[PDB]
Amino acid sequence: GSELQYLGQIQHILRCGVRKDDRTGTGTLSVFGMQARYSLRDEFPLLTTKRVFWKGVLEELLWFIKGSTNAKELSSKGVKIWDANGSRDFLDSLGFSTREEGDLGPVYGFQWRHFGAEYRDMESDYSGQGVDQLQRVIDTIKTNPDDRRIIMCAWNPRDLPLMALPPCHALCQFYVVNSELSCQLYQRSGDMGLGVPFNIASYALLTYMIAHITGLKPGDFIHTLGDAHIYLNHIEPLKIQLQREPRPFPKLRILRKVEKIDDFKAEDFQIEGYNPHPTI
Amino acid sequence: GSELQYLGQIQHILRCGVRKDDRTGTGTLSVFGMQARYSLRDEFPLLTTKRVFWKGVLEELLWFIKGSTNAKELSSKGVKIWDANGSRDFLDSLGFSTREEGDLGPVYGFQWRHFGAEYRDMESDYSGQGVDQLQRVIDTIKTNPDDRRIIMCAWNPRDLPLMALPPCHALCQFYVVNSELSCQLYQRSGDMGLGVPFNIASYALLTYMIAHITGLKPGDFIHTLGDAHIYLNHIEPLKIQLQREPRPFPKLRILRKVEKIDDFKAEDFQIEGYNPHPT
């Protein structure tokens, strides 16, 4: 069971994690180096022991694909998860006083579509600039599925300081065998309680999208974590969630045949049968 | 973090791996996404079921650290593992007609010490150019141990076309807690029988070096693999190797207090009690 692996990681962190503070000084139980395999075969890994913000997962990814680094473009979709990091106070705390609100810097969207390009601002035109990693992985999957270099890297040391926040998802690698597309994510830091479930859904979704455009079947989503942690305040709540028997994962349905990654829209996706346990 | 995890991985690939060919149409049994943990606490992960080319590991790493991209600089040390990719014929095959022999392009050393810098040639001076990820990692470890961004990435989409080979160890992350330095390597592709043991030792050594430079004790080396594979002509040999009784890992002795990562020399290291099953 995929979810069982996730809950297993949580148990392991409770049993073997050690105290480790984050940037704010808040404590967490932490374990370095973890890995879970989530099958994407005939099911979508949207955790059931606790509700995952699906609209956020979907809109954020379409926003990444779009190459946007403007939090306002995601906020207007009803997803505010990046608004704080693009706010005046936050951008100023980073020294980006002349940066317009919403300008997150060269984050995912930019890295994925224009890696290496000289970031100006969120409104700048980068067409033809940088390496379009996303389309490249798609091309490679179609032409040379055996390729062991189908990677999309968001971790750009040069652009790091310009980003409102360093990416938690440094890079992901795709793999194809027997008509199945698999994806492994290297997540440098994961909040098992709140972020990871969302993280998992995001990349499983990216895989489903690429598999659809490349005519492959979703295979496995391998979630690799660097600092896998649990905030101390989620220990008891998590001990409760761990008591809940996971439910069948929902299924993802793509309502139409999409040809290019850029053509996907929120409306083309439908999460069916998602029945998460009641909020804790 | 035992060698039993490495053996277990081999066992799993032999058991669940599926046929997948490499760039040369050569078949391998492959599993995508694997991870093994190797304790570095009072022991060094130099595999004992089959001898690892320690000199190669040590010299290659020192070579990475000095930021060299000149295979000749490593070859002169008696380590020829990079010579082929820097040869006149190989360089020309990739269209690098203007490159002096040995010029591997912006590979590991360059990325590690000058990420983002404009690669010219192996003789070019890149002082203060690009991001020195290695020193930054060391600086961050010393100043903010809790940092969850202690990463050194060799994967540079931008420089890929200029390299003799795309980096295999795409990136590694370090982690500090309870005065222990851990390192996790994300290896996109790994030949379980040949490269992986070497790869493991390389990053284990790097961790030992940085741990020593930062006054921390080596913790764990987590090896994460993308396409973990075994070449077909290695199945039987590896199955035999799986029969070999794993022995206690040797110890890595650092014979001197080194202040800067750049000051480490081959002679500062000594593998002790390495007793691998003969080949």
Side-chain angles (χ1 to χ4, degrees):
Chain A
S2 299
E3 178 136 24
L4 294 176
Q5 286 189 60
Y6 164 74
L7 298 174
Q9 297 190 307
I10 285 184
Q11 291 179 310
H12 181 271
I13 297 173
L14 292 176
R15 177 195 304 186
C16 303
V18 290
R19 177 189 181 178
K20 184 167 182 290
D21 295 348
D22 61 11
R23 317 193 66 63
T24 73
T26 305
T28 75
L29 260 186
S30 171
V31 174
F32 186 62
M34 294 193 88
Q35 191 178 78
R37 181 178 299 271
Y38 297 104
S39 176
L40 305 178
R41 310 183 181 72
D42 292 320
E43 75 184 330
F44 190 82
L46 200 61
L47 303 186
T48 62
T49 53
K50 191 191 179 191
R51 183 181 300 289
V52 181
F53 182 28
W54 172 255
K55 184 183 185 174
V57 172
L58 178 58
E59 294 295 350
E60 183 199 53
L61 186 60
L62 294 164
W63 175 73
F64 289 156
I65 294 173
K66 193 156 56 182
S68 179
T69 55
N70 182 350
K72 292 187 180 184
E73 291 177 56
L74 178 58
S75 191
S76 68
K77 297 297 179 181
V79 182
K80 315 304 192 293
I81 67 183
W82 280 93
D83 293 2
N85 291 104
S87 63
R88 202 82 287 297
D89 288 356
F90 189 70
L91 285 182
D92 290 348
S93 74
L94 296 186
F96 302 119
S97 57
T98 55
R99 193 179 278 187
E100 296 308 317
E101 280 195 46
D103 195 325
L104 304 166
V107 290
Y108 300 101
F110 187 73
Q111 297 308 322
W112 287 10
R113 303 298 215 146
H114 307 290
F115 190 108
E118 175 187 357
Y119 189 73
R120 300 279 185 166
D121 60 65
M122 64 179 184
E123 309 283 35
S124 304
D125 168 45
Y126 304 111
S127 61
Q129 297 176 53
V131 180
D132 187 341
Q133 292 181 280
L134 180 52
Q135 184 54 227
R136 184 171 175 188
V137 306
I138 292 176
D139 290 335
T140 301
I141 292 173
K142 286 183 174 178
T143 62
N144 183 29
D146 294 328
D147 194 86
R148 304 191 296 209
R149 294 96 80 114
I150 311 175
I151 295 176
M152 184 156 62
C153 188
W155 197 265
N156 188 330
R158 156 174 290 192
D159 288 337
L160 238 46
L162 298 180
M163 300 176 193
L165 221 50
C168 286
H169 318 312
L171 65 71
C172 57
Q173 177 182 183
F174 293 95
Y175 169 102
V176 180
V177 80
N178 305 330
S179 300
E180 290 191 310
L181 176 65
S182 290
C183 174
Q184 169 160 37
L185 164 69
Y186 184 78
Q187 189 173 330
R188 68 175 176 72
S189 179
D191 179 322
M192 300 299 296
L194 300 307
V196 172
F198 184 110
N199 304 146
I200 291 167
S202 182
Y203 281 87
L205 174 53
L206 177 59
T207 304
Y208 259 83
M209 290 179 81
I210 295 181
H212 181 276
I213 294 170
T214 56
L216 296 172
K217 307 173 299 179
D220 290 307
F221 166 60
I222 297 76
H223 184 49
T224 290
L225 282 166
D227 189 326
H229 54 268
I230 292 174
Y231 280 76
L232 296 178
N233 292 313
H234 305 326
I235 293 178
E236 290 314 307
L238 281 173
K239 287 180 179 175
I240 297 172
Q241 189 177 329
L242 270 288
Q243 305 285 57
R244 307 170 181 168
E245 292 184 302
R247 299 167 170 175
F249 275 150
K251 299 191 188 303
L252 176 64
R253 180 186 171 190
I254 298 177
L255 310 183
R256 44 171 279 253
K257 171 177 176 52
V258 183
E259 301 300 305
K260 302 161 184 173
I261 193 69
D262 320 79
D263 309 328
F264 278 116
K265 297 187 176 62
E267 49 197 45
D268 303 326
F269 303 88
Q270 174 183 299
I271 270 289
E272 314 173 321
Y274 184 44
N275 185 56
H277 280 274
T279 313
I280 167 174
Chain B
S2 62
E3 189 171 344
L4 288 162
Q5 283 192 50
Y6 163 77
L7 292 180
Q9 293 187 308
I10 288 179
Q11 182 56 67
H12 181 265
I13 291 173
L14 291 180
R15 182 176 72 274
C16 308
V18 297
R19 176 165 180 168
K20 188 170 180 285
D21 300 318
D22 67 10
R23 309 186 78 64
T24 65
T26 303
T28 75
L29 277 190
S30 169
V31 169
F32 184 59
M34 301 198 83
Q35 177 172 288
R37 180 178 301 270
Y38 296 95
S39 183
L40 304 177
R41 310 186 181 70
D42 190 46
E43 71 182 333
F44 191 79
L46 195 59
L47 304 201
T48 65
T49 48
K50 183 180 175 183
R51 180 178 294 287
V52 175
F53 184 31
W54 176 247
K55 182 185 186 183
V57 174
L58 175 49
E59 296 292 355
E60 183 197 51
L61 184 61
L62 292 172
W63 178 68
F64 287 156
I65 293 169
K66 57 169 68 175
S68 177
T69 55
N70 184 177
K72 301 177 67 176
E73 177 51 40
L74 183 57
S75 196
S76 69
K77 267 64 178 61
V79 178
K80 319 164 199 175
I81 64 186
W82 282 89
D83 297 346
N85 296 91
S87 65
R88 180 69 283 147
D89 294 324
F90 187 78
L91 293 183
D92 294 319
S93 72
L94 295 179
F96 302 122
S97 307
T98 63
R99 282 191 187 176
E100 287 300 298
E101 209 165 9
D103 197 327
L104 307 165
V107 292
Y108 301 103
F110 186 80
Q111 293 310 324
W112 283 18
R113 295 294 207 150
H114 309 294
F115 192 104
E118 293 308 301
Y119 190 75
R120 287 175 270 143
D121 64 58
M122 61 176 213
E123 302 294 359
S124 304
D125 181 64
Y126 302 112
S127 291
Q129 286 175 51
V131 181
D132 186 340
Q133 298 182 278
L134 183 54
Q135 192 50 238
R136 185 177 183 179
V137 156
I138 295 165
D139 288 355
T140 308
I141 286 170
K142 295 190 178 186
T143 62
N144 196 180
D146 297 331
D147 192 88
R148 302 187 298 207
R149 297 78 165 288
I150 309 175
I151 293 170
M152 177 161 72
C153 183
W155 194 263
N156 191 335
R158 185 167 170 288
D159 292 344
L160 252 44
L162 302 176
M163 302 180 185
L165 289 169
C168 196
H169 8 305
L171 83 64
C172 61
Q173 174 180 184
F174 291 90
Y175 164 103
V176 180
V177 84
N178 304 322
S179 299
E180 294 197 314
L181 176 65
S182 290
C183 170
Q184 168 165 33
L185 166 71
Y186 184 82
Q187 189 169 336
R188 67 177 180 74
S189 171
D191 182 334
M192 298 303 296
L194 162 63
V196 168
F198 186 105
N199 308 138
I200 290 170
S202 185
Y203 283 82
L205 174 59
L206 179 55
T207 303
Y208 259 74
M209 287 178 180
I210 296 174
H212 178 288
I213 295 298
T214 58
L216 296 170
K217 301 137 56 196
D220 294 307
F221 165 61
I222 297 85
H223 182 54
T224 291
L225 281 170
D227 187 326
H229 55 270
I230 293 171
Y231 279 84
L232 297 180
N233 58 152
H234 289 159
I235 300 295
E236 295 316 306
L238 288 184
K239 299 217 310 180
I240 286 177
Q241 205 181 309
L242 291 180
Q243 309 294 52
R244 294 182 181 175
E245 311 88 345
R247 294 161 177 179
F249 278 141
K251 281 183 184 57
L252 171 60
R253 246 90 218 200
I254 297 181
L255 311 172
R256 173 228 302 175
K257 182 62 197 71
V258 184
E259 302 307 311
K260 304 294 296 178
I261 188 69
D262 311 76
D263 310 323
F264 277 123
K265 294 177 174 300
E267 318 72 13
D268 300 322
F269 303 89
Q270 210 68 57
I271 287 295
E272 172 186 300
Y274 185 42
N275 178 52
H277 289 282
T279 307

